[PDB]
């Protein structure tokens, strides 16, 4: 089953490079990696400044259907909506297909439930007006407590998140199977599985990991639920493991 799981995970991957030393050449190489011998990843994830050259690279290699995702309010998740919205508008103008925005998780931990709602909603409004999907990163490894993880997921969903995403990859603790279960249970309990996807990020490293995460989705929503609109692997390291499991 591991081989079948690995191809499924590959076709759901948000193949990521988000490094301080990123260059145009590193992003072009990433676009080439996204076109694998066994099929294409769902998307790439890059800083907003690399969207235009990534678009041309994906087009010229014959994979314009690989989506371009990016990050905003990132990685800090500050509570300044004007800044988060301006970055989101810039990402749209660069050409993003998808924006992964960081939820203001420290403000929620400090007792501000409203700002996360208002921030997600403002960014969702800009994205939806551009036919851009909005993922919300809640930073589970900083929230830590299950109740806060549920609360942040719930606020994000009510404010219009198209995906909820565990982590930035820029803190020590990122996706865990337990954090994934909690957030997917929020999707389940709210009844929003048709409109809200799930994205574990930065914690999924091996083909075995990816199978475990997809098993949670299959168990909660049925094996047909986890398609590209409802599940992605945010990963900068996993692709080589999945290709190894597939004999490539």
Author numbering: 3 to 250
Quote what the paper states about this structure.
These have revealed that despite of relatively low sequence identity, all DERA enzymes have the ubiquitous TIM (α/β)8-barrel fold where the catalytic amino acids as well as other amino acid residues around the active site seem to be relatively well conserved. The DERA reaction proceeds via Schiff base formation between an active site lysine residue (K167 in Ec DERA) and the donor acetaldehyde substrate.
In addition, the crystal structure of one of the best Ec DERA variants, C47V/G204A/S239D, having improved activity towards acetaldehyde and basically no activity on DRP or DR, derived from the 3rd mutagenesis around, was determined from the crystal soaked with DRP. The electron density map showed elongated electron density corresponding to approximately two carbon atoms. No binding of DRP or glyceraldehyde-3-phosphate could be detected. The conformation of the loop containing mutation G204A has pushed the position of its Cα atom by 1.0 Å towards active site, thus narrowing it. Because the residues of this loop participate in phosphate binding (of glyceraldehyde-3-phosphate acceptor), the S239D mutation would probably decrease binding of DRP both by introducing a negatively charged amino acid residue (phosphate being also negatively charged) and by narrowing the active site entrance. On the other hand, the C47V mutation, located relatively close to the catalytic K167 residue (about 5 Å), has caused only minimal alteration in the position of this amino acid residue, as it is located in the middle of β-strand.
